[PDB]
Amino acid sequence: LAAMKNFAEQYAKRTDTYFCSDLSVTAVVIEGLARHKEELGSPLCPCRHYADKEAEVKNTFWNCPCVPMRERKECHCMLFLTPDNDFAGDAQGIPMETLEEKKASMA
Amino acid sequence: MNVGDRVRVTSSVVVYHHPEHAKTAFDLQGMEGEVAAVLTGWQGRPISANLPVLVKFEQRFKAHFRPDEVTLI
Ligand code: SF4
């Protein structure tokens, strides 16, 4: 979870992209990425439905950062947002506490 | 569509991983390449790539497209 947190923050700065104005959204995706990397070994995008999560991982198209994000700076999850995006805040960092709160409230 | 088919990027597609325009927005529109793959599955297991057409261009550069963004040459 901590490694996924650091990854997002660094990638966001590396690509000149920003986190959602509402960090809870960001938190949910990071927690989901962390979760997928544990169960699958890779950061498979958690904001999608797959028929074969294991195959997806082997193909790598959707392993974060996915092909659309690496090539077109397109993140349908709203994890990495371009400056012009309406939902883009000015933050490229997210408190660890925020994530902890998500682990606390899942359901 | 077939692997090996030559295609021209007809739609406007802005990318940031081109070897001569790293981290910089570059439109591939007008460029011509060869289809290297059409992502549908891995070892028979269906995948969901939403940019399934993999096109290889010169300069050791490749990029993914939707079937509708390129035209058979
Ligand atoms: S859409 Fe792509 S870049 Fe965004 S969280 Fe999913 S895998 Fe990562």
Residue partners of A17: CB distance under 8 A and separation at least 6: A11, A73, A75, A80, A81, A82, A83, A88, A92
Among candidates A48, A54, A61 on the partner chain, residue whose Cβ is nearest the Cβ of B39? A61
Q: Dihedral, CA atoms, A60, A63, A64, A70, nearest 10 degrees?
A: 20
- Under a CB-based contact definition with an 8 Å cutoff, are residues A26 and A12 in contact? no
Determined by which method?
X-ray
Interfacial residues of A (vs B; Cβ cutoff 8 Å): 15, 48, 50-52, 54-56, 58-59, 61-62, 67-68, 70-73
Residue partners of B67: CB distance under 8 A and separation at least 6: B1, B52, B53
Q: Dihedral, CA atoms, A59, A61, A65, A70, nearest 10 degrees?
A: 130
Residue contact B16–A72, C-beta within 8 A: yes
- Under a CB-based contact definition with an 8 Å cutoff, are residues B58 and A72 in contact? no
| Phi then psi dihedrals of residue A33, to 5 deg | -65, -50
- Under a CB-based contact definition with an 8 Å cutoff, are residues A72 and B16 in contact? yes
Neighbours of A4 (CB within 10 A): 21
Q: Dihedral, CA atoms, A40, B54, B5, B73, nearest 10 degrees?
A: 150
Q: Is A75 in the pocket of ligand 1 (CB under 6 A)?
A: yes
Q: Please name each of the domains of chain B with its CATH number.
A: 1-73 (2.30.30.50)
Q: Where are the domains of chain A?
A: 1-107
Q: Name the residue type at position A96.
A: M
Residue contact B48–A71, C-beta within 8 A: no
> Parallel, antiparallel, or unpaired for β B41-42 and B45-46?
antiparallel
Q: Report domain A1-107's class.
A: alpha beta
